[PDB]
Amino acid sequence: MVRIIVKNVSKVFKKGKVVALDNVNINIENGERFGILGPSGAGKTTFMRIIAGLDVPSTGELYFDDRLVASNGKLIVPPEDRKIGMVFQTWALYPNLTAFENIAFPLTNMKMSKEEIRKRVEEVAKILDIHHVLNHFPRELSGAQQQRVALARALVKDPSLLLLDEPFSNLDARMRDSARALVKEVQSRLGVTLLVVSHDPADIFAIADRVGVLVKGKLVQVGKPEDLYDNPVSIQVASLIGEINELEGKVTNEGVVIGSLRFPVSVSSDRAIIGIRPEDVKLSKDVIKDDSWILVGKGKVKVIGYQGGLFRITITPLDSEEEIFTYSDHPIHSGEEVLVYVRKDKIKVFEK
């Protein structure tokens, strides 16, 4: 419902000594689901605060449609006038207001009568299925209910933009898929532009259609989540978007050599960084009969972990301390020599 133009936006702290954002440029389209991933919670939150109007660019400009809302150290349109709904891990519910009172709060000075406020709060509460707990204080609500009250609070003034900063991090892991699905449903129903920032790529894959990755205050890649996943511009982006094994080796005519492993790829430099995701690795004790996998050499099991009902098997090549982990239905015990296969088209390689 609103287009966001981020034009050469920079943000410094400590009188210039810290550069949290460095010349960020993004054009977010009306109704787009956009995500930001990156190593710095603070930097991502800084970006989010600038979009919300809780902070301003040190240099550069920010537009909502064609309206200049902030520019070069000046706040031009404050948050309450930007048609934004915020679901921020750091913006909690007021503990001594009931759910109703929490949801009604943003309407206090919106020139609405008592009945108008009640009708609006009840309407939103019904849609988010918390109408029946409106009289409860937050402490007496379940985690999912608190999430829903926070979302109702964000939606009560009918925003054009929904901003989410670590929105599911208060919830038990088991409840997050439901919460992500609810946010997806809300966005579809309202058609709001949506911006989500998170440390967790699962939030990005679930909700965002286009994602930018922030490293050291710089937007280093922008694209569909699957494109960042399969075609990352760097090993750092590769790891931000999902699990990956990072190995360093020597470039040779026969491939990149890492001890007893050799990957059939090359780069122009003397050494290379190999990226291979755990799903793109398979181990065996003898050759397999499957031409969709290629042999890269021998390895030895170093250690096994157990997670999600699967065995996390870590190997190293012979004559190397570099590690590769993968997940399996069955264990291969520590010290065992194995053959290492990978998906050829999934090997990522970068110059060192």
Side-chain angles (χ1 to χ4, degrees), residues 1-73 75-125 127-171 173 175-184 186-215 217-225 227-288 290-318 320-336 338-352:
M1 291 169 62
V2 60
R3 280 198 94 233
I4 309 299
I5 294 182
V6 181
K7 190 72 189 187
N8 301 131
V9 164
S10 295
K11 181 62 180 181
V12 307
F13 293 107
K14 295 165 172 291
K15 303 189 75 164
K17 182 167 176 167
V18 170
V19 179
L21 299 170
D22 188 347
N23 221 75
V24 175
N25 287 283
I26 318 171
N27 302 322
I28 300 174
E29 296 301 327
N30 180 132
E32 185 172 28
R33 298 177 341 176
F34 197 88
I36 298 283
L37 286 170
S40 189
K44 291 179 289 198
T45 286
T46 292
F47 181 77
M48 183 132 275
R49 284 174 70 80
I50 285 173
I51 306 303
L54 296 169
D55 201 350
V56 296
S58 298
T59 55
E61 303 85 41
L62 179 65
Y63 300 82
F64 277 36
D65 289 338
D66 20 12
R67 337 170 265 256
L68 179 70
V69 300
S71 175
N72 299 284
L75 182 63
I76 296 170
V77 176
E80 65 270 21
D81 294 343
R82 289 188 188 191
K83 300 212 90 155
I84 299 176
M86 292 170 287
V87 178
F88 290 173
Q89 183 170 228
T90 54
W91 186 24
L93 300 175
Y94 282 97
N96 201 27
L97 286 188
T98 59
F100 179 91
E101 289 179 309
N102 265 282
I103 300 168
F105 192 74
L107 302 183
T108 299
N109 302 302
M110 298 303 297
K111 297 183 286 70
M112 296 173 60
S113 69
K114 190 167 317 300
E115 272 299 292
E116 290 178 308
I117 290 169
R118 182 191 59 72
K119 289 179 186 180
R120 179 58 181 161
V121 171
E122 286 193 41
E123 168 182 52
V124 177
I127 288 165
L128 292 176
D129 195 31
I130 45 169
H131 186 269
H132 57 294
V133 294
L134 285 167
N135 285 173
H136 291 211
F137 288 113
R139 186 177 64 181
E140 284 68 64
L141 297 178
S142 68
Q145 289 169 341
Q146 293 163 355
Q147 192 86 15
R148 292 170 178 251
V149 173
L151 189 54
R153 181 179 58 186
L155 297 175
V156 80
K157 295 189 291 180
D158 208 55
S160 292
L161 173 61
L162 182 59
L163 303 179
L164 305 172
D165 186 340
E166 292 285 330
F168 313 119
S169 304
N170 283 348
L171 294 171
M175 255 37 192
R176 295 181 179 147
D177 283 334
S178 25
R180 294 164 182 134
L182 177 62
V183 165
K184 178 172 176 174
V186 159
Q187 191 282 328
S188 184
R189 176 165 62 73
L190 296 179
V192 291
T193 299
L194 180 156
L195 175 65
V196 58
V197 310
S198 184
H199 71 290
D200 191 354
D203 290 342
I204 293 302
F205 276 98
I207 293 163
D209 293 322
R210 190 164 57 117
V211 26
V213 183
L214 262 18
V215 178
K218 295 186 181 177
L219 190 68
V220 297
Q221 187 169 4
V222 169
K224 293 175 172 173
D227 289 335
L228 270 64
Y229 196 78
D230 288 337
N231 301 297
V233 73
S234 69
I235 197 66
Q236 186 157 202
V237 169
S239 73
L240 282 162
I241 191 78
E243 295 199 321
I244 193 162
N245 295 287
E246 308 176 18
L247 299 89
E248 182 186 321
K250 183 184 188 178
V251 165
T252 81
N253 289 164
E254 314 300 310
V256 177
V257 170
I258 309 177
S260 56
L261 299 185
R262 195 166 59 197
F263 292 83
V265 293
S266 185
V267 286
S268 293
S269 55
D270 280 344
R271 301 184 65 78
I273 298 170
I274 291 287
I276 190 77
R277 296 197 190 281
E279 66 264 27
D280 299 321
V281 175
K282 180 173 174 72
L283 310 176
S284 63
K285 293 286 293 183
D286 201 346
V287 301
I288 64 183
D290 188 342
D291 77 359
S292 64
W293 290 98
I294 60 159
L295 265 176
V296 293
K298 302 160 60 174
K300 177 173 165 178
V301 180
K302 175 180 183 173
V303 62
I304 302 176
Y306 184 56
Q307 59 174 85
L310 297 182
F311 296 97
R312 188 183 189 277
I313 307 174
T314 294
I315 66 100
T316 67
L318 273 66
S320 175
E321 294 180 278
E322 298 292 290
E323 296 175 354
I324 290 178
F325 67 91
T326 189
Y327 299 97
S328 182
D329 287 325
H330 284 86
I332 304 174
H333 76 268
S334 182
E336 279 286 82
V338 296
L339 300 186
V340 183
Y341 286 86
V342 303
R343 299 290 197 196
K344 181 182 175 82
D345 67 356
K346 301 288 180 178
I347 301 164
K348 298 148 181 62
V349 68
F350 309 93
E351 293 182 25
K352 166 83 177 313

